[PDB]
Amino acid sequence: ERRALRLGVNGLPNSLEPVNAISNVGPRIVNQIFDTLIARDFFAKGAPGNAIDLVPALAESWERIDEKSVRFKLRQKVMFHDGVELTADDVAYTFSSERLWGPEAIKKIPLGKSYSLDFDEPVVEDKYTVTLRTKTPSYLIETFVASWMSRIVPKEYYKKLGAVDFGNKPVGTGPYKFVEFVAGDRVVLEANDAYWGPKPTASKITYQIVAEPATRVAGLISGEYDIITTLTPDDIQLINSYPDLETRGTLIENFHMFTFNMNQEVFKDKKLRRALALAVNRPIMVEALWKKQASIPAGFNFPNYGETFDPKRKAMEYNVEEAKRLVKESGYDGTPITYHTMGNYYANAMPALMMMIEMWKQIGVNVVMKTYAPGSFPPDNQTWMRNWSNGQWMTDAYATIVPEFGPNGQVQKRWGWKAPAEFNELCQKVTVLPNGKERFDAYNRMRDIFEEEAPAVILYQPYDVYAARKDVHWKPVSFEMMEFRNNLSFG
């Protein structure tokens, strides 16, 4: 009786294990299979899909015990897809040293420790009561359990299969259950009619890879898909010309950037990094490539940070004259500097780079584009400049400045950023402090240091574009995922 939902997608994750699925392509699938203790209600109080309000989900209630622990009271009679009732043991296993953050878990979940809080082992109080703890103070537990790191897995089934096999046959408590995974082709899910929350409205959901955007668009016009993903503002005109189709767009909690291999001689010091950063004309790029729909943030600072968003911050500096001076006073000899890009994996990456190459030519820096295929990122030492993006995954400023740019992150450890000691000291403080003047000011000083050092250069917050049949009602949310709970209906 319910319609089957057909999605034309850009790609699929290599695993359906919820943490290993973290990417631009995984969350739209794993958000259906699993649930979290606390859920973010993006549509709360009439918000246009960007609210940061947190509501009960698998946890009916919770109570903070002290500076490092929160006791959760679980919803009762919740069923995993295989008919196993959800208990405190499943939640304890989800946040355990064994599965997630411990030294053994590292080979199974590569970002398990990197993206997690400083967890201590959870405590099971009774069948429906579990306490999550951190080894050092953390006022981020509640916020973290509403994030993409926190989908609840079943203990017994996950242990039996192991992380790899679980990723190929996942079981969760979510509104849709697993049917099929054809690697590099399609994922099929079916309605979980035992779901504890709003009943699924589609009988089935198929995530079909259609690699090229023009082919994805043709698929929607051909009547092959109900919703297609990964379009840009340039597609709006064509789609909306069809009486039965329309685009649905939103800014997402992510930023596009370029960064440097600071192990390379030319990028060890901040001089040329700053020169390149100061020559980036973001307003022209936003108008030219995004139809003014992308947003230029005032620093490493986004509205989803909530209490740690600073709406009064000064804009990131644009100064061609200073940029020219810096190149001249730096060691820079005019030798071409490479900038690696995985084609247009980041929307508009190649035209954005063409524009920046001209801005850089004008200050006396010769930058050359280099492309690579998926899974072929070059050996680190063969790279100089490269593009990147970071999904801002917490309703708090902790992510991604601390896990990516902090003392434990890849920018310093793999990419050679020798961050000022003050920056690392502040990363530690914001990790352990509650919200207040000290934590708020620490993020602003970290944002200032980030701009002064230029280990990366923020371009903008992208504007994601979907296209859909007008008969299929579904609203985008401000994140790299698709939400169907109370947000998918047909007719």
Numbering used by the authors: 31 to 521
Paper's wording?
To our knowledge, the best known system that exemplifies this paradigm is the antibiotic agrocin 84, which penetrates into the cytoplasm of the bacterial pathogen Agrobacterium tumefaciens strain C58 by hijacking the PBP called AccA and its cognate transporter. AccA also plays a key-role in the importation of the characteristic plant tumour-derived compounds such as the opines agrocinopines A and B discovered in 1981 in crown gall tumour tissue. The mature AccA structure is a monomer of 493 residues composed of two lobes, each formed by a central β-sheet flanked by α-helices. We identified the pyranose-2-phosphate-like moiety shared by these two ligands as the key recognition template for AccA.
The unliganded AccA structure solved at 1.7 Å resolution adopts an open conformation. Indeed, superposition with the liganded structures results in an average rmsd of 1.5 Å for all Cα atoms and structural comparisons show that upon ligand binding, a 12° rotation around an axis defined by the two hinge residues, Met292 and Tyr493, leads to a similar closed form of the protein. The biggest lobe (lobe 1) consists of residues 29–280 and 494–521 and the smallest (lobe 2) comprises the residues 285–489. The two lobes are connected by a very short hinge region of 8 residues defining two short segments.
